Amino acid sequence: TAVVQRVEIHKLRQGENLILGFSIGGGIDQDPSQNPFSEDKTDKGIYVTRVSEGGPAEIAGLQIGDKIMQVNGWDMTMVTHDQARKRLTKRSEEVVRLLVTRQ
């Protein structure tokens, strides 16, 4: 089954950007049957597809395959891919808390 995890990522400055050190796939505008990480291939949610060795997300405990449920209290289960990306990369936010589930 899935276990709930709560991680707290402190973004890393890389030049002008604040970065999280991971990648995402999914979103309501994408084909969920293409998601290799989900248990249920109708799941249109946002999944962690890669984590950078030594980066903020790794340090915080994020793992490849995690499903992102919320970012700073903001629901991520019914958003487009771009909407998810934007929520994760707000320039004004250095700290982001992710609610995730992990198989």
Binding site: G25, Q30, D31, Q34, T49, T89
Partner: peptide, 10 residues
């Protein structure tokens, strides 16, 4: 990578 399933670096 999968052209039918984009990923984004953040």
């Amino acid at each position: 990578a999968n052209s039918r399933w984009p990923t984004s670096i953040i």
